[model samples]
Target chain A: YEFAEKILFTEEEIRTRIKEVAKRIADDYKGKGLRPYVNPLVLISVLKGSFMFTADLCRALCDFNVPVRMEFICVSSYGEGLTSSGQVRMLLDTRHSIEGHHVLIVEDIVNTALTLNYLYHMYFTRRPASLKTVVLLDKREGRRVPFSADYVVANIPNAFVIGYGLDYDDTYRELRDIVVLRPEVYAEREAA
Target chain B: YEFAEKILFTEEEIRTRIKEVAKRIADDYKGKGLRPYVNPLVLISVLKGSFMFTADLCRALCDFNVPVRMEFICVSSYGEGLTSSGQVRMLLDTRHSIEGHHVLIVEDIVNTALTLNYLYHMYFTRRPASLKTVVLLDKREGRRVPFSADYVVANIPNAFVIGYGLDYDDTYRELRDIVVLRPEVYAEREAARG
Candidate 1:
């Protein structure tokens, strides 16, 4: 059942870094967030991949007593084999009226940053008070577009990782540790 | 924080009941779901208030190894004070293409069942393999519509029990237990959160 020969970052390491980032977030927003009567901080997780990271990150935030109101955004990347359309398919539930609200966008990893860039553009419609980004893995492969993460737990190589909330076809996300896929394994997928 | 004077259901009580519902879910969909190379199950949660129930219920499902792919659907009630438009201004990020997929809709509570009914009507386009519902609290308050729940965690008398993922004007949702508003408390009407 072990799909990868290489382990990029162990679960323990990732969690420790998550907590570290949580502490930094706490420090940054101490008086600014959840004051005597402020709307709870808003955290939006890019869905599908970011679920585990968001859950763990929120848990860490709670230990730091950083209150937040959370939401998740999902988008589509149409592709066939190795090529992605570079087009974003998105929908919003439009339930949160986010005007004047501070928000953080959480992602599992950033490859091209295309979707993040697309997401950033969309949030403007609500005119949020402020917006920021966070990621579990920051793949620094000359992002396809010009968006950067505000917080990152780790900078992984330009590798296909499929664990600890990342996935290959959505199967390996539940794997406990962050894993690197075998070269032939991914290539086989492309061929199929 | 203690705006709630009466505790309706403690957190432990709610979760214990949650897993019980989780078990029934497993029984209902055991081999019938995710068998013969079915993809991961699709679990949908309404945003904000339903989050806590969705998270805890999914955790219970995971412990039961239910294998779900989770998504959140946020809908606007479109109202102010106590008066609502009765019109649900809803939108969907149609990324999932849930056609032929077995889906479960999880909620914090089912008050009128109107929105859930609307959601039920909406999913017909995606053409799911199966559709069901799970709610933490079910109040038999002569629902505005006739939609019934596929699963209910607890049956409470008609009361606005907030907490455990239920909220009032986006408040008290983070509370750990189910608390009931005192008499004459919530009756001071205002339009719903706009």
Candidate 2:
């Protein structure tokens, strides 16, 4: 499935932002003595949408010599429809046990905060040593829940945007840059 | 689930049979030069059914110094129903990879051979070094698939049987001996539950 949205950020802008996020993460965990024992296992890119961003960010972390492991947890919230149903189902679970370990959940975007909040509590049940969240885009101002990301890359308007691993239907997540969706696309879907 | 069956064999009979099976296995592999390199991983009785038989069989094999690892695979053929549907889906796979390893499939009883055949082909694709089937009881002849157990303890007519791991819709699996189902009980269930 594809969505109608123009590219917002250029490829260079997205790449620069990813590097900045990685540097910040490296700085925070630097010399924190969390390695080998108490290894930092960052749960990167919860599939589908966050795949591209997670890959780039993980590579950046490697360049910084961050001693960390990586995992992917595929969760679905919106399902086959456009609107968020606000219910999360675990399509796949992390193969690595998070017991007594530091876990950082990386996400492409955060909007209503319901889905992530549910996940935070769900992961908490596993009894990880520490838990943190990092999101590339944060629309906290429009959040329906009192949840915030530990690291937020950028904040944009309420306009429906696509690209940079975000999609309207299933499309535009492959786009290189973030851009707002054209109104005509939404209008046509609403009519249908 | 408990089955309404008359006890056929005592625990002593079962122990005797297991010893006989173990002797056959030992003789077949004795001095064959396959023991050192081949660690024969024993597929144990499927849960809720083969627990008793597996425990005894494992002990019997131990005397021969056969390095056997045990694993149980649960299969659901017919959904919440009474009769066999001739279909099998793996509820669980062995955690240890069987690739390049010798595997022996152990079961409490063999009937239509539908579920066993399904598992045979499924494991065959995994490319194990070798595979063999073993059953405690073989029910009649006329199996839909052209396959026979590498080892069999006894052969009997196609009567409704339970115990020593077999159950009727989740019953009588805990019974200590192989037993025949009561005709009335079988009739009631056959008509009532589909």
Candidate 3:
């Protein structure tokens, strides 16, 4: 109540968006008619934020019975004081990986894409069957490079969005619906 | 609902037990003198199972204003068919450590303590300031090993029990209170279990 002003994506809106992405993603794989994958589609979540979306999205994919495996990789930067200069690096890498498979990097918002750019470099070297990207939200703010995702749940204004996997000081993550915060609300955290 | 015969602890009972441990832990650490911990009091959760307890316990500690650092170490096993030889090894290690601080290992149950003994050796080599262990249940059955915990919720039956971070094929873990399963109930599970 004190944290958010309004739910940007009502629960229904978010569910509908996720179902659409799941359907489109399902269709995308079906069209690939390429070669037999040694493993099903691999969903690698970028954690500390993407977990909520990752869990729900994975369930949706499996309900459709899409062939897929799950993995998670964490790159720690928050410890370096929020917004540290581009020293983005892997804090922990999952034991199982995207090697020799169609690896789709699933995540939350990507504004600078600096982290994603680095992740792309890391996985590219590992040699997956093919690699693609997807996100729950794509923010094209002072964004750099031609960053793109194979799929998206929604796009939004350059305001601070938090909830349903997005968090501010770890408070709003438990909110069931995605919501945007007033500048003053999140600025206190940003300033620190 | 379909899996449980009856809710044993109910949410209140579990909360009560958690607060007890939290208070005891608070006093235990407070008596450690007025010296500062070189790092946050290290909390290593034996992963995939201990996460739930770790989170709640950590929150309770903070509310008491307990200064502590949190980390997780996951030991990968169970893929080698059903009763994967207890030869488990650390699949991943915690980046931050307890090299110079008091360390508390939070876990669910300690049956044989075989795995806990093995883990203690690994942590002992790391050189913590002090070492202590805690668990929700202590089943002194089929128990072989001199391992003991500094804190525990209850001395449970030798029979099988699960909940509050413990599971049966991944079910009943989300239950608040800890409950014992009927012999037939868990026997049906033990043969093909994780």
Candidate 4:
């Protein structure tokens, strides 16, 4: 019921890590007339959680002079229940056409690899010119499904942290910094 | 050019008038609850001009406890031209299903009334429970066809005015007060048309 433990990341450290990731992406797709043909790389943020992170990262990438178009896809794996149901439902689809376009999928945290792996296959069949994954945090504990992030900010133990765009029952997503949810608060809900 | 013209209704006058209109609507629909398997009222605002007015009117109507929903429809009779061609094309349709609901169409101005009359027949065929129109301004001189507003605020001359929801080539819509367009500007366009 309770968040098992807190995995705290300072705001300063998080911002620095995001900037590093942006530089790498800029280098990968810089110049070479790649932009004119494939300019404005499409960013598909897995919504509800990735909105805040996606906005920040896209702003950071603006310095590279690449036009960025943002679209949101709301995929839900849990239906009012805790833990992944292993079935993903498309609540909302991306508005941008992804055919023959470079797409970068952004997620707040990559855990269990089950949902992300399923999504990867779904998007790959669409035949985008390029596809990559970026995760704010990488939890490497539970990997029942095989998946890896092309870009990751930090790797931490399988602990539930709230804030900085992660939420418990949609409450803690507004928190500015990542903090471990107190065990007492979460335990009471689990008991109920 | 310059909008150097006398002010007709100040900002306060317009606000007070809109509030009065809202009150009248509220009184009419009060306690009209669940009329034997009747759906909620659907408010359809003609877009690009009525958006601001529709938002305000709907918020005010919410106090009346009338179950209401809103949608926007954008229509154009003038495409890449200065004047309407007496033909209408719907750019956006209502998102709310109006199959069985009473519908209220809102507009900023009713000029020739031809486009709206066409829309009335088009929507009535869809079998709404009822349908009516509310217009902010009525230029009575330009009635080339048979159509009228069920509720109207002001009757104005045929002079062109911009702002308070009217536009001249999409500009001047952001103005808070309506102002008459310069005669020379319209004259130039008239010359160009000829």
Candidate 5:
């Protein structure tokens, strides 16, 4: 708790917001006659951070009767400094083909938008029936690329935030709520 | 619902059992003085089927004050028939290195054990401080390899079970409880082929 400066979204708040996101997805898909046994939504979760969000989102989608097949895709950004070099490597790809499915890329946070953009462009060529992006947090100020997620839960300020599957040095992911890290935590790391 | 024959493990039952498994893990790691900041437990989830189980298991571990970092590994078995060819390929691997860490491989089910065995052999080369496996369901009768998971939630019969992360043709994974699939469902699929 020392590292967490303030709670950005309480656990209950996130749960309620996720329900709204699910309803929007259900409405959009229902408009297209999306149903079980036909036109199931293919959810591609960007891993390491999106696992918990994707798991919760999937169950919510199930509550709305949206047939979904889950897939995990992992990508890593390479750069020496804070800004990325615009180079991303695909550590993992979807297990099954998404060439003709209505696909949605689920992510925990979108900062710089480079990695997500890389995914969007890479998957665009595979020619899914449709490809859209959804994110739990959108740090729009940090975006260097001209891209936007189709659905977003919250637009957060540019701060060191972690929790609800987001991590700091591979920790704090199990924290039930989203929180901003104390500035001293970053300062200490930089000092080292 | 009609495709389900009987409920094998209800949601509450699985929840209670997971707590026991978590405590066992907590006890094991705690005995080693596993704590935050240093010597955290690395959980590597074999994905697609293990996602839900891993998620729930992780929270339970948190409740036990077990510090954990998660990684996902995806593997696919190639075969032309019901039985595997023992040819498994890694579709994904852990993002970070697991060397000199307490690593646990979390899986949903162990059937032929070929895939899990393959993973065990592969990770054995990584030289981790320790490596263990935990599974939700252990279909011991179907195991073709000489291997056993360190911790298991349930030992199941050699039946077609789906739900709680198990799937039938990639569906039914969202079902809250584990259930046995009706035999006629398989009969229909086979009949269509002939």
Candidate 6:
């Protein structure tokens, strides 16, 4: 079985914060000429990692009367390791063209910020009316790029963390809480 | 503003069915010799349409002690109309290789059955250990190909439906209830194109 040493964010804590963040997001987007019916705001979820966060966040937005159009893009760091190779690979693009729509990127975590920054530049080229990013976790330790998310749930340390849409070797994603893995786990992985 | 002539499936109905189907799924896979931890079953969802269905289904599987690994593939019929041109476009592919892993294809609605069949053959080439499909809605009216989902929540009739991730020009996806759109709605679009 996988070993988790610490539970960083409990299920209730993350959900409570998501609701608060959703309220703030609605306030910011409201009365900004972003029509909920006509050209509703587009939420582009960074897939595989942000799937859970995006699903919950989108449902939360409904309570605020913020109509959302869902789009998904799958971008990931080239390989798995403590440090990224700084290469971003795009496995999928949003099916709908977002040239004139207001776009918000829903991400699970911002580790090195390389992948997020890459997505920022790529989506910028499309000339959206407005662009912003919201992330559930912000790790400021190894941020390789000079960027910040417009909205964040919490600022976490540089420890090895997984769960709540975050994964370690494609496991622990279904875990209800965000947790920090034991150091031996990484050591065992490295040894293998 | 969107107009819906009838509610095809209410929110409660779909949720209820999802729970029941999840139970059945768990029972079927209970002793199939599939390891839950080592190599959990992979759920490859057909995107754009199956997004909502996949999210709910994955969560429901959690309750039945079924471990799941989610993957998404974006495939479309290439164009929008009453009939698909029989052309399939691969907008996205699964990030992880499915070789030797048990894979389940989660779909929203199987209309022409062409897209599902194409995916069946495409993933078949990878030589998965086992492969199966599950769908929330199955429309048999215009099924051009002879294929059926291993598991289906409901069979729907041929109608222009929208809601619960089904959309018309990218609206009504947020609606919880599945509903059929009025004929006048399509009439309006056809006239606009004219």
lDDT score for residue B80 of model 2: 34
Q: Candidate 2: misplaced stretches above 4 Å?
A: A1-192, B1-5, B32-40, B78-82, B190-194
Tens-digit lDDT track of model 2 for B1-194 = 23345567776787798889988877776554343224554453454345456555755765555545555566666433446787776655665678887778887777778877887888889888778888888874747776788999888787777666565654444445678888777677657664
Enumerate residue pairs that collide in model 1: A91-B93, B80-B191, B81-B190, B81-B191, B81-B192, B82-B190, B82-B191, B83-B191
Off by over 4 Å in 6: A9-13, A36-38, A76-87, B78-83
CAPRI-style class, candidate 2: incorrect
Question: What's candidate 5's i-RMS value?
Answer: 1.5
Best by TM-score: 5
Tens-digit lDDT string for candidate 4 (B1-194)? 25525455555676677777767776765554522114456777675567545544554554444445555566767532346689887766765467777888988888888778877887888898778888887888788787878878778898777666565554444344667878676566557555
Per-residue lDDT of model 1, residues A1-192, tens digit only: 345868888768888999999999888877675631156677887776786677677767766777677676666655554334344666543347678887788888988887677777677667988878889888887587777888989897877888766767655655657888887888887687
lDDT of 5 by residue, A36-75 (tens): 4346798899888998888888878877888887778887
lDDT of 5 by residue, B42-110 (tens): 899997789888878887898888989888888877321234567787888887788898899999998
lDDT (0-100) at residue B18 of candidate 3?
Answer: 81
- What is the lDDT of every predicted structure here? 0.72, 0.67, 0.67, 0.67, 0.84, 0.82
lDDT of 1 at A113: 82
Q: What is the TM-score of chain B in candidate 6?
A: 0.93
| Candidate 5, position A156, lDDT | 94
Give the TM-score of chain A in candidate 6. 0.91
Pairs of residues at least 3 apart in sequence or in different chains that clash in candidate 4? A1-A186, A2-A187
Worst 10 residues of 3 chain B by lDDT: B76-85
- List, for all models, the DockQ compared with the true complex: 0.23, 0.01, 0.09, 0.04, 0.59, 0.47
Ranking by DockQ: 5, 6, 1, 3, 4, 2
Please list the residue runs of candidate 4 whose C-alpha ends up more than 4 Å from where it truly belongs after superposition: A1-192, B34-39, B79-82, B186-194
TM-score of 5: 0.91
* Model 5 misplaced regions, further than 4 Å: A35-38, A78-87, B78-85, B186-194
lDDT of model number 5 = 0.84
Arrange candidates, best TM-score first. Answer: 5, 6, 1, 3, 4, 2
Least accurate stretch of 10 residues (summed lDDT) in model 2 chain A?
Answer: A36-45
- Backbone clash pairs in model 2 (N, Cα, C under 3 Å; residues 3+ apart or in different chains), count: 7
